[PDB]
Protein backbone atom coordinates (compact mmCIF):
# COMPACT_ATOMS: atom_id res chain seq x y z
CA UNK A 1 0.00 0.00 0.00
CA UNK A 2 2.35 2.74 1.60
CA UNK A 3 4.72 1.04 -1.35
CA UNK A 4 2.75 1.75 -4.45
CA UNK A 5 1.97 5.35 -2.61
CA UNK A 6 5.82 6.23 -2.86
CA UNK A 7 6.47 4.89 -6.13
CA UNK A 8 3.28 6.57 -7.37
CA UNK A 9 5.15 10.12 -6.07
CA UNK A 10 8.13 9.20 -7.46
CA UNK A 11 6.53 8.95 -11.06
CA UNK A 12 4.62 12.05 -10.59
CA UNK A 13 7.69 14.00 -10.91
CA UNK A 14 8.65 12.78 -14.44
CA UNK A 15 6.73 14.73 -17.39
CA UNK A 16 7.08 11.28 -19.21
CA UNK A 17 3.35 10.71 -19.97
CA UNK A 18 3.89 7.26 -19.42
CA UNK A 19 5.19 7.93 -16.50
CA UNK A 20 2.20 9.97 -15.28
CA UNK A 21 -0.37 7.97 -16.06
CA UNK A 22 1.25 5.22 -14.27
CA UNK A 23 1.39 7.70 -11.41
CA UNK A 24 -2.57 8.17 -11.35
CA UNK A 25 -3.12 4.42 -11.96
CA UNK A 26 -1.12 3.91 -8.62
CA UNK A 27 -2.97 6.32 -6.16
CA UNK A 28 -6.37 5.96 -7.71
CA UNK A 29 -5.93 2.29 -6.59
CA UNK A 30 -4.90 3.63 -3.16
CA UNK A 31 -8.33 5.54 -2.98
CA UNK A 32 -9.82 2.17 -4.14
CA UNK A 33 -8.28 0.22 -1.44
CA UNK A 34 -8.57 2.70 1.23
CA UNK A 35 -11.43 4.61 0.18
CA UNK A 36 -11.39 7.44 3.00
CA UNK A 37 -7.84 7.24 4.58
CA UNK A 38 -5.35 9.39 5.10
CA UNK A 39 -3.42 7.48 2.25
CA UNK A 40 -6.45 8.51 -0.22
CA UNK A 41 -5.71 12.24 0.98
CA UNK A 42 -2.08 11.83 0.19
CA UNK A 43 -3.06 9.91 -2.90
CA UNK A 44 -5.86 12.83 -4.42
CA UNK A 45 -2.71 15.20 -4.06
CA UNK A 46 -0.24 13.13 -6.18
CA UNK A 47 -2.78 12.72 -9.44
CA UNK A 48 -3.85 16.37 -9.29
CA UNK A 49 0.03 16.91 -9.68
CA UNK A 50 0.53 13.99 -12.07
CA UNK A 51 -2.66 15.29 -14.18
CA UNK A 52 -1.26 18.81 -13.95
CA UNK A 53 1.87 17.76 -15.79
CA UNK A 54 -0.03 15.63 -17.76
CA UNK A 55 -2.41 18.40 -19.32
CA UNK A 56 0.97 20.12 -20.20
CA UNK A 57 1.98 17.77 -23.22
CA UNK A 58 1.30 18.32 -26.44
CA UNK A 59 -0.58 14.50 -27.26
CA UNK A 60 -4.25 14.74 -26.79
CA UNK A 61 -4.26 11.17 -25.31
CA UNK A 62 -1.91 12.43 -22.64
CA UNK A 63 -3.96 15.14 -22.10
CA UNK A 64 -7.33 13.51 -22.02
CA UNK A 65 -5.84 10.88 -19.52
CA UNK A 66 -5.38 14.29 -17.32
CA UNK A 67 -9.08 15.18 -17.87
CA UNK A 68 -10.13 11.98 -16.63
CA UNK A 69 -8.22 12.25 -13.93
CA UNK A 70 -9.24 15.47 -12.56
CA UNK A 71 -12.51 14.92 -13.05
CA UNK A 72 -12.62 12.26 -10.78
CA UNK A 73 -10.80 14.46 -8.32
CA UNK A 74 -13.39 16.53 -8.81
CA UNK A 75 -16.20 14.30 -8.23
CA UNK A 76 -14.70 12.90 -5.46
CA UNK A 77 -13.80 16.27 -3.28
CA UNK A 78 -16.61 18.26 -4.37
CA UNK A 79 -13.47 20.55 -5.82
CA UNK A 80 -14.67 23.38 -7.91
CA UNK A 81 -11.09 24.44 -9.22
CA UNK A 82 -10.89 20.60 -10.27
CA UNK A 83 -13.25 20.45 -12.41
CA UNK A 84 -12.97 23.81 -13.99
CA UNK A 85 -8.81 22.45 -14.69
CA UNK A 86 -10.56 19.23 -16.33
CA UNK A 87 -12.72 21.55 -18.42
CA UNK A 88 -9.08 23.41 -19.40
CA UNK A 89 -7.83 20.16 -20.00
CA UNK A 90 -10.66 18.74 -22.12
CA UNK A 91 -11.20 21.52 -24.62
CA UNK A 92 -7.07 21.40 -25.14
CA UNK A 93 -7.65 17.80 -26.06
CA UNK A 94 -10.17 18.64 -28.15
CA UNK A 95 -9.20 21.10 -30.55
CA UNK A 96 -5.80 19.16 -30.80
CA UNK A 97 -8.06 16.07 -31.91
CA UNK A 98 -9.88 18.29 -33.94
CA UNK A 99 -6.87 19.47 -35.65
CA UNK A 100 -6.25 16.41 -36.78
CA UNK A 101 -9.59 15.35 -37.86
CA UNK A 102 -9.97 13.11 -35.74
CA UNK A 103 -13.64 12.51 -34.71
CA UNK A 104 -13.52 9.72 -32.27
CA UNK A 105 -10.74 11.20 -30.18
CA UNK A 106 -12.42 14.42 -29.87
CA UNK A 107 -15.97 12.52 -28.33
CA UNK A 108 -13.48 11.33 -26.03
CA UNK A 109 -12.86 14.69 -24.84
CA UNK A 110 -16.10 16.38 -25.17
CA UNK A 111 -17.70 13.92 -22.86
CA UNK A 112 -15.10 14.78 -20.11
CA UNK A 113 -15.57 18.31 -20.94
CA UNK A 114 -19.46 18.20 -20.69
CA UNK A 115 -19.32 15.91 -17.57
CA UNK A 116 -17.39 18.36 -15.89
CA UNK A 117 -19.32 21.05 -16.94
CA UNK A 118 -22.67 19.54 -15.50
CA UNK A 119 -20.56 19.18 -12.04
CA UNK A 120 -19.85 22.44 -11.79
CA UNK A 121 -23.50 23.71 -12.74
CA UNK A 122 -24.50 21.11 -10.31
CA UNK A 123 -21.51 22.60 -7.47
CA UNK A 124 -22.83 26.58 -8.84
CA UNK A 125 -26.73 25.66 -7.72
CA UNK A 126 -27.99 25.64 -11.18
CA UNK A 127 -31.26 23.14 -11.97
CA UNK A 128 -31.73 20.12 -12.80
CA UNK A 129 -33.96 21.34 -15.41
CA UNK A 130 -31.38 23.43 -16.83
CA UNK A 131 -28.59 21.41 -16.39
CA UNK A 132 -30.82 18.41 -18.60
CA UNK A 133 -31.34 21.07 -21.17
CA UNK A 134 -27.15 22.36 -21.19
CA UNK A 135 -26.69 18.17 -21.73
CA UNK A 136 -29.51 18.30 -24.42
CA UNK A 137 -28.78 21.23 -26.93
CA UNK A 138 -24.76 19.99 -26.54
CA UNK A 139 -25.50 16.61 -27.66
CA UNK A 140 -28.25 17.14 -30.10
CA UNK A 141 -25.86 20.08 -31.83
CA UNK A 142 -22.91 17.68 -31.60
CA UNK A 143 -25.52 14.81 -33.35
CA UNK A 144 -26.21 17.33 -36.11
CA UNK A 145 -22.78 18.49 -36.77
CA UNK A 146 -20.91 14.77 -36.98
CA UNK A 147 -24.01 14.12 -39.27
CA UNK A 148 -23.04 17.13 -41.82
CA UNK A 149 -19.58 15.85 -41.47
CA UNK A 150 -19.78 12.56 -42.47
CA UNK A 151 -18.87 10.44 -39.84
CA UNK A 152 -20.20 6.83 -39.23
CA UNK A 153 -23.42 5.86 -37.45
CA UNK A 154 -20.90 4.04 -35.05
CA UNK A 155 -18.70 6.99 -34.43
CA UNK A 156 -21.61 9.23 -33.44
CA UNK A 157 -23.51 6.68 -31.14
CA UNK A 158 -20.15 6.25 -29.22
CA UNK A 159 -19.72 9.51 -29.26
CA UNK A 160 -23.61 10.40 -27.61
CA UNK A 161 -22.42 6.92 -24.93
CA UNK A 162 -20.03 8.53 -24.19
CA UNK A 163 -21.00 11.57 -23.51
CA UNK A 164 -24.02 10.54 -21.27
CA UNK A 165 -21.91 7.43 -19.28
CA UNK A 166 -19.41 10.39 -18.30
CA UNK A 167 -22.32 12.89 -16.81
CA UNK A 168 -23.92 9.72 -14.79
CA UNK A 169 -20.59 8.54 -13.46
CA UNK A 170 -19.19 12.15 -12.59
CA UNK A 171 -23.48 12.34 -10.89
CA UNK A 172 -22.38 9.36 -9.16
CA UNK A 173 -19.07 9.67 -7.55
CA UNK A 174 -20.47 13.39 -6.71
CA UNK A 175 -22.78 11.65 -4.41
CA UNK A 176 -26.07 12.15 -6.87
CA UNK A 177 -28.37 9.54 -5.99
CA UNK A 178 -29.90 7.35 -8.87
CA UNK A 179 -33.01 8.80 -8.74
CA UNK A 180 -31.90 12.53 -9.53
CA UNK A 181 -29.69 11.34 -12.35
CA UNK A 182 -31.97 8.95 -14.09
CA UNK A 183 -34.72 12.35 -13.74
CA UNK A 184 -31.60 14.59 -15.58
CA UNK A 185 -31.33 11.51 -18.17
CA UNK A 186 -35.02 11.34 -18.89
CA UNK A 187 -35.43 15.39 -19.09
CA UNK A 188 -32.14 15.03 -21.45
CA UNK A 189 -33.74 12.20 -23.71
CA UNK A 190 -37.11 13.51 -23.92
CA UNK A 191 -35.72 17.03 -25.17
CA UNK A 192 -32.98 15.13 -27.50
CA UNK A 193 -35.93 13.50 -29.17
CA UNK A 194 -37.91 16.28 -30.21
CA UNK A 195 -34.84 18.15 -31.76
CA UNK A 196 -33.81 15.11 -33.53
CA1 LIG B 1 -14.41 6.62 -15.50
Known amino acids: LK ?13 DPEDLKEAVRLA ?9 SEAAK ?18 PEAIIAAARALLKIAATTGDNEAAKQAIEAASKAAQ ?3 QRGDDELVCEALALLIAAQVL ?24 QRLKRKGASYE ?21 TSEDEI ?15
Open 3 to 15: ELLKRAEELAKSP
Open 28 to 36: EEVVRERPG
Open 42 to 59: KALEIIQEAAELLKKSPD
Open 96 to 98: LAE
Open 120 to 143: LLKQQGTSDEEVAEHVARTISQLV
Open 155 to 175: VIKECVQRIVEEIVEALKRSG
Open 182 to 196: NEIVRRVKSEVERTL
